[PDB]
Every structure is written in structure tokens, then in C-alpha cells.
Write a protein that binds this ligand. Structure first.
Ligand code: 30W
Lengths: 97, 383, 268
């Protein structure tokens, strides 16, 4: 087992009234059985997941992204599922504000 | 160890000797197997504290024997054993089982690396990653036009009895494993010896990491030279076993892996392989946000390695049924100037009706004991 | 310049774990992928599809299929050597590197359940081992000198030749580069403590460094360094931040450098 490491970030600086894109980078995981869920206020939003790439460190990389409209009143987060883990990992995003 | 110029007595040790079933192995391709066929003769020269037996000691009682099995190799000693003189004593003290293994330098499918001749090897290792030595030895047999005359210790060690052996070169270490902290200084432990009839060319130290073995230090013809980092002392002269240690400046992440100590002589070469792990212990700080109907718990866990320390929050009440928190969240996994990692975590607290206790617990391989911090949360109505 | 080939599978796969994966990379973008389900070689780059005839794609696929089958055989052999009756993972990695000064290198490593198993040293022509089985195999493989020239060429000749060809084939794309954009703000990460946070995004390749000055002098406190985070737009992101005291009324400047471009922020 290699527990995933997770970070969450925007593609461009979020701003109220200006729709944007939300990324999450999951790296250093193994085996490659990862599903990334991006959420707004705990609710799943439209998202896509890209290829799982190899690392030199016996691990894999994975990028996933979603579409959202920035809102300083709202909160954002990500949860990443892993077959070989009892519980998905929970990471908080500071909305890059 | 200081050279054994004090009070000591040599004792006779016998260890179970393994032999690979070459051509009859459990697997597909191997030159080693954990199955005994014979024993090796070993020498030990421990320093005596009592001398209760005058000219003997049971220091190595766990390995000492007087009874020779049907098959046993003389393993004559023409070189210095001192560095390992108490290797088996320390093993017995720790209760670590000791084994040994014999093999061959003879190749049939290709060119023999020692120019086809009756030369063999014998390894001795203490279980648990303890002291380890690789012996290079010869058998005084002669042939002209024969192919298998060595014999090749296969399948059987010999049609009868045992062939004579003598060690002319060996490489040894006190440990097969090292452990240091990230950012902390370190060293490698190894040494070697040889018969007077064998000269020394060079010694190399290499690091196994990132898919490649790379040189970090070399010593040749009296001259030491670093290519990445480290420093050595001049090898001893004949009469005492030679050092092959390496002093290492503060280690970083790149320096983690397995180190190899390679000794090349005028005739033969050998190496020991020592794994070096690096860790760092988390540090924890905790504070509660002021006011709010649901005060926020903020905790930072910093200065640890490797990354992704496990963090769990706990909630306890004044009785009832305390329980763990499977929620919370983490963020902000990053490195420090020291190369160490840091991570943040937070949790929304429920003050409860009469107050509640919250703890942030941290688990890591570098932590002998649980690490974390506690705080109380006081309801607005309990201020 | 990087070229990487990966091969991974599992001995008696369980829990839906992928049976066999093989993927190739150059620099900072995939070039090819193999699907072990339909048993097909596919491009991941437009200049791979261009500069490789259908004839080669089919031929390579058949080669990969052979390797897939033989790999599964290896997996069973490993269980025998490890004496493991359960299900276990195993993978190998190889590639090369071309340096600006014209020199070349490369690597070759194996792992068992994520643990270092064997590494080949092309320069000493020997194998490096960790655990008991690795030592068993080390001696066996070193004894067999017929692998000597093969293993050396495998790391050097095959990989380097491919890399140089790939660099030519994708020359129209592999020279892509973009400067970063920068944004700096303050935020609270811990009560009584203020964090000064710099984000940088939209740069390629990720040859970037961020640092801080305090009143014109080098900072003295610790510094939080992020990693390299794909944007999905062909570029990457990073970030660096420093911890400020609650009494820290000092002036900081943010330095962001990439691709020869140097930005210095006079305020936030
Ligand atoms: C001898 C050997 O195994 N070399 C080798 N050649 C390749 N040629 C093409 C591809 C991609 O389709 N992958 C490889 C690979 O992984 N290894």
C-alpha cells in the first residue's frame, strides 16, 4: 500500500461572478485504484478524471478537475477514494483566496 | 574495536552451512537456498572479563561446538578476524540466530570470473540484520584438462569427506542496517582484511537509489576523493584488519537508500551491502479558535519524514461514550528548509452542553510513543 | 531530456487491481500507452501517430502482447522464490537521460510490493540487491555473463536511440515553454500566526523557484515549499509561503524566477 497524497487548487484565481476551473492532484499512490471526487458544500459537482501516470518512485500520478462558479460565501473540498483504504481521504481547499 | 592486544582466548565455532540446490531449486533461477548440508569452521577471539575457564570461554556458547559433522570446511584463517571476534557473542547476547552459506566462483555456461580454478566463497550472517562477513577462500586442488574437478559443491558438497579451504580475503560489517534522522550527520560501517600475499588497490562507496547505483566516495592508492560527500581514514597496514567506513555530512532525502562498500584487491574483490533509512519525528501544536458557536480546532504537524503522517481527531465527553472523529480534514502538505515535511489539519468542534475535550493524535513510524495535543472547548453559555 | 518505459502487473490479481500496464513517456508528456484488456498499442501524442506507420503500431502491439504473457510467467516464478501463496504486486522500470553537455545516462530497477528489489549498475556491470530473494537472484544474474552486454545496451543503446528520435519527432511541440503568473496574499493558517502565501501558475516546463526577502535581507525563518502541480492545460503550478509573527511589521518582497524571467513584487 502507498497512501495517496492530495492537494487541491484552482486553475486561475477564483473570483465571485467569474466561473473557473478546479483541480485536484493525487500523487504517490499504489496501487493505481483511485477515484477523485470534487465537491461544493459537500455536494458532488461535474468533474473529469485523467490518465494514471507512472512515477520513478514505484507510485502513480493522477490529475482530476471540475467546473464551478467561485463564491466567497461557499466552501469547497475534495474526497479521494482508494480501493485498498478503509476510508476515502478528506482534504480541504482554501479557495485560493 | 581496538585491536585485540588485551586478554583473550581463541575458541572454535561451528555454524550450519547452507547450499543452493542448483539444478533442483524450488524456484526457477537462483544461486542461494536456505537449506543446510554441512557446517563451517569459525574462529572467535573475544576479550575475557573473568577467565573462569582459563583457556576458554562460553561467550559464544550459542555457536560453539566440539563435535564435527560428517561434512565441515576448515576455513583456515590467514587474515585478521578481530573486528568480528565478538560478532557471535553479541548475537548470543541478543539471542539472534546465526547461519552461514557456501558457494562457488566456478562458471560452466560462461567464462569463470576467477579463471577456472578451485575457488569458493562462504558467507556468515547474524539474523535480524546483524554482523555480516563474506569470505573468499581457495582449495588446493590441481587439474589439467578436466571440467568438473573442483568439485563445484553440487548437488552434493563432496563424494566423500570435505575439501580443504583457506580464507585469503574477506569483507565484513558490524551491521546490515543503519538508521539516522533527516538533516542529521551519519556514517557507514564496514571493513576488510587479507593475507600478506594480497595487496589493496582501492575502496569505493556507492549509494543505491533512484534506479541507479552512484559513487559518493572513493579511496585509491592512498588518496581519498569525494564525488558527492564524505570522508575516510587511511586503511590500516598488514597485521590489523583495515577500516572501510565513511563519514557522512548531514543527510538529505536523496541520500536515503542502500549503501555498498566495495573493496578491490590485486587479485579479488568483494562488498557488503548496508541499508540506510532516514526518518524525522513529527512536532505538534494546537490552538482553539475564539468565540463562534462552533469553535474551530487548528493543529499543525510539522518536521517529519517521510511525508503523509497519519492524524486522527478524538472527541471525549464528561462520561457517556467517548468516540473517535472520522471526519475533520487535512491540507497543505509541504516541505521545509530542512527537507522535512509538514501538514495541517482542522476540525469543527461541538462545545456540547457542559463542555467537551478534543485531541489531535499523530501516528508515525518515527514515534515510539503516541504524539498529539489536547484542548477544552467551552460553550458560549459556559463562559 | 527523459525517456521512460514502465511495466507493471499483479500475481493473481485481487480486488479488481489492474492485471498488466505498460506506458511510455518522454520529457513531461506521455507518448504511448498499452491496453492489456484489448491488447492494443495506442499513441498519446499526435507526433507519435504521425511518425510511426500502422505497420509499426501493429508489430509493436504483438511484441507487447508477448511481453505481457511472459511477464505473467515471471509473476508466478516470483511467488515460488518468495514462497508466497498469496497475491502480490510486481513491476519494473527502465529509461534514459540525455544531458545538455552531450553526455548520457539511464536506469533499471525492479520492485516487489513497492519495495526495492534489484537495480542494475551499467557502469560496474553488476546488480544491487536488498532482501533475501534479491540477493539470491543477484548472484544468479551476475553469474550469467550472457546478460552482461544485453543489460548494458538495454539501458543505453535502445533507450537513447528512441529518445533522440522522439525529440526530433515532437520537435514542434517539445520546445514549448511559458512564463509563470504570480499572485501573493495574506491568510491565517494558525491562531496568532499570519501566513504570507505566493501562488505561481501557468508555466512550462516546471523550472521554477520562489523565494522571499525581508527588508532587503534574506529571510531567517522557515519556509513552506509546495510541489509541482499540473494545471491540465499543459502547464504546471507551484507555491511558496513563509510564517510571520503577529508582531511582524516588516516589509517582504516576493521573488519568482522561471525560464530566465524574474519578477519581484514590491508589495502585496
Ligand atoms: C529490450 C527491451 O525491452 N527494450 C524495450 N523496448 C521497447 N520498445 C518499445 C516500447 C514501447 O512500445 N517499449 C519498450 C520497452 O519497454 N523496452
Amino acid at each position: 500500500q502507498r497512501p495517496p497524497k492530495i492537494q487541491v487548487y484552482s486553475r486561475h484565481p477564483p473570483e465571485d461572478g467569474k466561473p473557473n476551473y478546479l483541480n485536484c492532484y493525487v500523487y504517490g499512490f499504489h496501487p493505481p485504484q483511485i477515484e477523485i471526487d470534487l465537491l461544493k458544500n459537500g455536494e458532488k459537482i461535474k468533474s473529469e478524471q485523467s490518465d494514471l501516470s507512472f512515477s520513478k518512485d514505484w507510485s502513480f500520478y493522477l490529475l482530476s478537475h471540475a467546473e464551478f462558479t467561485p463564491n466567497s460565501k461557499d466552501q469547497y473540498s475534495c474526497r479521494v477514494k482508494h480501493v485498498t483504504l478503509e476510508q476515502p481521504r478528506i482534504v480541504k481547499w482554501d479557495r485560493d483566496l | 574495536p581496538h585491536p585485540a592486544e588485551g586478554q583473550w582466548r581463541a575458541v572454535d565455532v561451528v555454524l550450519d552451512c547452507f547450499l543452493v540446490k542448483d539444478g533442483a531449486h524450488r524456484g526457477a533461477c537462483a544461486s542461494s537456498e536456505d537449506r543446510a548440508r554441512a557446517s563451517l569452521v569459525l574462529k572467535q577471539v573475544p576479550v575475557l572479563d573473568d577467565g573462569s575457564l582459563e583457556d576458554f570461554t562460553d561467550f559464544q556458547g550459542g555457536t560453539l561446538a566440539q563435535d564435527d559433522p560428517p561434512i565441515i570446511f576448515e576455513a583456515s584463517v590467514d587474515l585478521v578476524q578481530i573486528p568480528q571476534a565478538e560478532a557471535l557473542l553479541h548475537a548470543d547476547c541478543s539471542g539472534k540466530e546465526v547461519t552461514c552459506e557456501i558457494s562457488r566462483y566456478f562458471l560452466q555456461m560462461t567464462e569463470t570470473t576467477v579463471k577456472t580454478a578451485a575457488w569458493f566463497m562462504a558467507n556468515v550472517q547474524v539474523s535480524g540484520g546483524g554482523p555480516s562477513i563474506s569470505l573468499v577462500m581457495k582449495t588446493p586442488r590441481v587439474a589439467k584438462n578436466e571440467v568438473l574437478w573442483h568439485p563445484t559443491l553440487n548437488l552434493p558438497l563432496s563424494p566423500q569427506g570435505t575439501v580443504r579451504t583457506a580464507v585469503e580475503f574477506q569483507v565484513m560489517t558490524q551491521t546490515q542496517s543503519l538508521s539516522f534522522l533527516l538533516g542529521s550527520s551519519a556514517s557507514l560501517d564496514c571493513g576488510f582484511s587479507m593475507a600478506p600475499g594480497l595487496d589493496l588497490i582501492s575502496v569505493e562507496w556507492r549509494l543505491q537509489h533512484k534506479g541507479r547505483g552512484q559513487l559518493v566516495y572513493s579511496w585509491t592508492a592512498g588518496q581519498g576523493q569525494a564525488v558527492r560527500k564524505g570522508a575516510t581514514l587511511e586503511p590500516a597496514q598488514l597485521g590489523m584488519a583495515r577500516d572501510a567506513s565513511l563519514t557522512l555530512p548531514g543527510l538529505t532525502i536523496q541520500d536515503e537508500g542502500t549503501y555498498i562498500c566495495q573493496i578491490t584487491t590485486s587479485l579479488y574483490r568483494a562488498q557488503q551491502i548496508i541499508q540506510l533509512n532516514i526518518q524525522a519525528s513529527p512536532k505538534v501544536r494546537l490552538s482553539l479558535a475564539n468565540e463562534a458557536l462552533l469553535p474551530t480546532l487548528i493543529c499543525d504537524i510539522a518536521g517529519y519524514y517521510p511525508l503523509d503522517v497519519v492524524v486522527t481527531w478524538t472527541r471525549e465527553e464528561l462520561g457517556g461514550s467517548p468516540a473517535q472523529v472520522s471526519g475533520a480534514s487535512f491540507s497543505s502538505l509541504r516541505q521545509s528548509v530542512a527537507g522535512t515535511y509538514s501538514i495541517s489539519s482542522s476540525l469543527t468542534a461541538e462545545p456540547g452542553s457542559a463542555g467537551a475535550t478534543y485531541t489531535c493524535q499523530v501516528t508515525h513510524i518515527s514515534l515510539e510513543e503516541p504524539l498529539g495535543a489536547s484542548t477544552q472547548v467551552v460553550p458560549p453559555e459556559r463562559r | 531530456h527523459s525517456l521512460r518505459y514502465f511495466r507493471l502487473g499483479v500475481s493473481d490479481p485481487i480486488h479488481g487491481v489492474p492485471e498488466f500496464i505498460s506506458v511510455g513517456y518522454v520529457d513531461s508528456h506521455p507518448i504511448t500507452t498499452y491496453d492489456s484488456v484489448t491488447r492494443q498499442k495506442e499513441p498519446r501524442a499526435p507526433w507519435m501517430a504521425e511518425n510511426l506507420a500502422p505497420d509499426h503500431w501493429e508489430r509493436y502491439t504483438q511484441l507487447l502482447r508477448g511481453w505481457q504473457q511472459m511477464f505473467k510467467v515471471e509473476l508466478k516464478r516470483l511467488q515460488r522464490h518468495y514462497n508466497h501463496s498469496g497475491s502480490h504486486t510486481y513491476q519494473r522500470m527502465i529509461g534514459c537521460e540525455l544531458l545538455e553537455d552531450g553526455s548520457t545516462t539511464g536506469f533499471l530497477q525492479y520492485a516487489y510490493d513497492g519495495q526495492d528489489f534489484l537495480i542494475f549498475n551499467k557502469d560496474t556491470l553488476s546488480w544491487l540487491a536488498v532482501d533475501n530473494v534479491a540477493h539470491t537472484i543477484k548472484q544468479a544474474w551476475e553469474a550469467n555473463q550472457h546478460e552482461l552486454l544485453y543489460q548494458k545496451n538495454w539501458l543505453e543503446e535502445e533507450c537513447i536511440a528512441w529518445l533522440k528520435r522522439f525529440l526530433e519527432y515532437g520537435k514542434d511541440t517539445l520546445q514549448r515553454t511559458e512564463p509563470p503568473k504570480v499572485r501573493v496574499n495574506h491568510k491565517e493558517t494558525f491562531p496568532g500566526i499570519t501566513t504570507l502565501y505566493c501562488r505561481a501558475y501557468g508555466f512550462y516546463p516546471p523550472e521554477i523557484s520562489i523565494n522571499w526577502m525581508k527588508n532587503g535581507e534574506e529571510i531567517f525563518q522557515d519556509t513552506d515549499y509546495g510541489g509541482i502541480l499540473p494545471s491540465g492545460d499543459g502547464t504546471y503550478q507551484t507555491w511558496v509561503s513563509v510564517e510571520l509573527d503577529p508582531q511582524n511589521g516588516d516589509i517582504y518582497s516576493c521573488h519568482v524566477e522561471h525560464g530566465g524571467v524574474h519578477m519581484v513584487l514590491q508589495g502585496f
